[PDB]
Amino acid sequence: EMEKEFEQIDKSGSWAAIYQDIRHEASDFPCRVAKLPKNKNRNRYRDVSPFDHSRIKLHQEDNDYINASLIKMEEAQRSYILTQGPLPNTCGHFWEMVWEQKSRGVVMLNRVMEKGSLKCAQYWPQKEEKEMIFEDTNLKLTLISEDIKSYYTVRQLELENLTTQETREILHFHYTTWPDFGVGESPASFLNFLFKVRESGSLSPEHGPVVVHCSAGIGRSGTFCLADTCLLLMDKRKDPSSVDIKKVLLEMRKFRMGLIQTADQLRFSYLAVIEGAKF
Ligand SMILES: [Cl-]
Ligand SMILES: [Cl-]
Ligand SMILES: [Cl-]
Ligand SMILES: [Cl-]
Ligand SMILES: [Cl-]
Ligand SMILES: [Cl-]
Ligand SMILES: [Cl-]
């Protein structure tokens, strides 16, 4: 069904056109807080801001602002936090959000440098003996172990609230092989990565929402959540062919602007959901 629609779009070459229809129909909500002067250095890209209604608020006494959005998919019964790659001055905010929102997993979809450009701060420790302390938000983060695989790496991190000395294990799922240009010929390793995140329990409703990021927190991140939600909808619905990817994406874009940044990414999402549904 969805498969048929896919071929028709490909035959007619109308990916660009469908994607531009999505951009035109997308919600527009205010982002007043994101745009306040005092928040200029908390945004990686001035063109990518959380809506006020869905922005994650930091709890500590201080500016509550982080560039992160809660995406609550009602029907699919899953929530995600989509955020930008942390900046050198917002790594403490980032981990503070993970703590306060009770996330179990963090999903990273870029390498810290790609095509020789910085997309994200080194916001986690690379060596066991060199833990990170975020003095502004009073948190300690330790690498406990890491499982480096061919197409992704999973790290076990210990996050300690230095105020309470409570500790939590955070799973860091780092997809390290998203192509430097365009998207993957095949969705196979992206889909295997998604299933590994699922299998870990990080997406379970007993935890806070998974934190998902890339550089701006809308393109690859949008792909990840879009595919995951569509696959949920396909397995839950009495009629699985009723899942409309374009509608699911528009619904997601009520919570954060600009999810899926290119017609290729849109096409890749279709591919990933189609291939995924089979599995
Ligand atoms: Cl201000
Ligand atoms: Cl939904
Ligand atoms: Cl492997
Ligand atoms: Cl699941
Ligand atoms: Cl990215
Ligand atoms: Cl739908
Ligand atoms: Cl857009």
mmCIF file of N, CA, C and O in Angstrom, residues 1-2 30 45 126 149 202 206:
data_model
loop_
_atom_site.group_PDB
_atom_site.id
_atom_site.type_symbol
_atom_site.label_atom_id
_atom_site.label_comp_id
_atom_site.label_asym_id
_atom_site.label_seq_id
_atom_site.Cartn_x
_atom_site.Cartn_y
_atom_site.Cartn_z
ATOM 1 N N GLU A 1 0.835 -1.219 0.000
ATOM 2 C CA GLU A 1 0.000 0.000 0.000
ATOM 3 C C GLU A 1 0.857 1.250 0.000
ATOM 4 O O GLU A 1 0.964 1.961 -1.001
ATOM 5 N N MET A 2 1.464 1.519 1.154
ATOM 6 C CA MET A 2 2.469 2.568 1.287
ATOM 7 C C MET A 2 3.540 2.341 0.225
ATOM 8 O O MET A 2 4.067 3.269 -0.377
ATOM 9 N N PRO A 30 4.559 30.412 18.136
ATOM 10 C CA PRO A 30 5.610 31.309 18.593
ATOM 11 C C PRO A 30 6.818 30.624 19.230
ATOM 12 O O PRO A 30 6.655 29.563 19.855
ATOM 13 N N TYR A 45 21.724 27.123 15.850
ATOM 14 C CA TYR A 45 21.279 27.723 14.587
ATOM 15 C C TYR A 45 20.119 28.699 14.832
ATOM 16 O O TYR A 45 19.068 28.307 15.344
ATOM 17 N N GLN A 126 35.153 10.420 26.914
ATOM 18 C CA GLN A 126 35.704 9.403 26.051
ATOM 19 C C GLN A 126 36.575 8.385 26.802
ATOM 20 O O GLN A 126 36.789 7.287 26.309
ATOM 21 N N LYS A 149 30.470 -1.023 17.757
ATOM 22 C CA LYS A 149 30.117 -1.957 16.710
ATOM 23 C C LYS A 149 30.412 -1.324 15.383
ATOM 24 O O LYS A 149 30.874 -0.198 15.321
ATOM 25 N N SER A 202 15.014 1.787 26.368
ATOM 26 C CA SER A 202 15.138 3.240 26.486
ATOM 27 C C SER A 202 13.904 3.989 26.052
ATOM 28 O O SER A 202 13.733 5.150 26.430
ATOM 29 N N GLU A 206 8.031 3.565 31.034
ATOM 30 C CA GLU A 206 8.404 3.621 32.446
ATOM 31 C C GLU A 206 9.536 4.635 32.633
ATOM 32 O O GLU A 206 9.768 5.128 33.750
#
